[PDB]
C-alpha cells in the first residue's frame, strides 16, 4: 500500500555541447551519488508517468487519462549518480527537471 519505485529525475538528453542525441536519456535517482553504487540500478525498468486529455485504456483496470513511455537503464554516466536510460520512444523534452519512476522488478540481487 506504499511506493514500489525509486525517485528519479530526467536531467536531459545524451549530449555534448553543440550536439544533442535524443535517443538516450540522463537520469538522476536521488539517493545515489557515486560510481561504485550505481550497479544496483543497471537494467532496471524506468517509466515516465504523465497524463493527457483524451481517455486511454489501462491493463487491469478502468480506462484513465494517464500514459507512459517505457524504458530501461543501460549503463552509468560520469561517476556522479548520473545514469543513462533508453526508452522505447524518445522523451518529449518537456519532462526535463520532472520526476519519473524507475522500478525494481527487473531485479537480480
Amino acid at each position: 500500500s506504499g511506493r514500489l519505485w525509486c525517485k528519479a529525475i530526467f536531467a536531459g538528453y545524451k549530449r555534448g555541447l553543440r550536439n544533442q542525441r535524443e535517443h538516450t536519456a540522463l537520469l538522476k535517482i536521488e539517493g545515489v551519488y557515486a560510481r561504485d553504487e550505481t550497479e544496483f540500478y543497471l537494467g532496471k525498468r524506468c517509466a515516465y508517468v504523465y497524463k493527457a486529455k483524451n481517455n486511454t485504456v489501462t491493463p487491469g483496470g478502468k480506462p484513465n487519462k494517464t500514459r507512459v513511455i517505457w524504458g530501461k537503464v543501460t549503463r552509468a554516466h560520469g561517476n556522479s549518480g548520473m545514469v543513462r536510460a533508453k526508452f522505447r520512444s524518445n522523451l518529449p523534452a518537456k519532462a526535463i527537471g520532472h520526476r519519473i519512476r524507475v522500478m525494481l522488478y527487473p531485479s537480480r540481487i
Binding site: 529525475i9 536531467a11 538522476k28 526535463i96 527537471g97 520532472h98 520526476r99
Partner: protein, 199 residues
C-alpha cells in the same frame, strides 16, 4: 520538498553554484537571510567590482538599460540569473522555482534552514584571507533597508529564544522519562541497540 537555505556564512558564487544546478532539476529552493552571504577578498575590492557595474548603463536610454538591483536578495538573484539559461523557456520556468528573500519571512520563520557545507566561508576560504559581507556592501550602494532588517532580525532572533528554551524544557522532560520508566521499557531498548540505535 522545498529547501530553505540560510544565507549567512556562504560564498556568493559557491552557494549559487549549488542552487542553480538544484533549480534546473525541478526542486524548489528558498534562499533566506541574503544579507549574510559574504564575498572573498577585502571589502574595498568587492565594492569597486560592483560600483563599476553601476557605471554599466546604456548612454542613450538608461531606463531600458541594466537594472542595478540594490537589495542583497536581488544581488544574489542576479548572480543566479547569469548562471541559468534564462533566455529559453526552461530557464524562465526555473526562476519561478527560486524564491529569494532578505531577512526571515514569517512563511519561513518556523522552518529549519539548510546549510550547504560546499559553500561556507570557514571550509572554503582560508582563515587568513579577507571577506566582505553582501549586506554591508549593499547599503553603501544604495540599499536603504538595513536598519529595518536588523531590528526585525533582532526581533526574530529573540522570538526563537523562547521556542528553543521551550524545546530544552521539553527535552529535559524527554530525558527525565527514561530515567523512571527504564524498568518496563528494558524489553524494548536492547532490540534498538543490537541494531545500532541509541549508542
Amino acid at each position: 520538498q522545498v529547501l530553505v537555505l540560510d544565507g549567512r556564512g556562504h560564498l556568493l558564487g559557491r552557494l549559487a553554484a549549488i542552487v542553480a544546478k538544484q533549480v534546473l532539476l525541478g526542486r524548489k529552493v528558498v534562499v533566506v537571510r541574503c544579507e549574510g552571504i559574504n564575498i572573498s577578498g577585502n571589502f574595498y575590492r568587492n565594492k569597486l567590482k560592483y560600483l563599476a557595474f553601476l557605471r554599466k548603463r546604456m548612454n542613450t536610454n538608461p531606463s531600458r538599460g541594466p537594472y542595478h538591483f540594490r537589495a542583497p536578495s536581488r544581488i544574489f538573484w542576479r548572480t543566479v540569473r547569469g548562471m541559468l539559461p534564462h533566455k529559453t523557456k526552461r530557464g524562465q520556468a526555473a526562476l519561478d522555482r527560486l524564491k529569494v528573500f532578505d531577512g526571515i519571512p514569517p512563511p519561513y520563520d518556523k522552518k529549519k534552514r539548510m546549510v550547504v557545507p560546499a559553500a561556507l566561508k570557514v571550509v572554503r576560504l582560508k582563515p587568513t584571507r579577507k571577506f566582505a559581507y553582501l549586506g554591508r556592501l549593499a547599503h553603501e550602494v544604495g540599499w536603504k533597508y538595513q536598519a529595518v532588517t536588523a531590528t526585525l532580525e533582532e526581533k526574530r532572533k529573540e522570538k526563537a529564544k523562547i521556542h528553543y528554551r521551550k524545546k530544552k524544557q521539553l527535552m529535559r522532560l524527554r530525558k527525565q522519562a527514561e530515567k523512571n520508566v527504564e524498568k518496563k521499557i528494558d524489553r524494548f531498548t536492547e532490540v534498538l541497540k543490537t541494531h545500532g540505535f541509541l549508542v
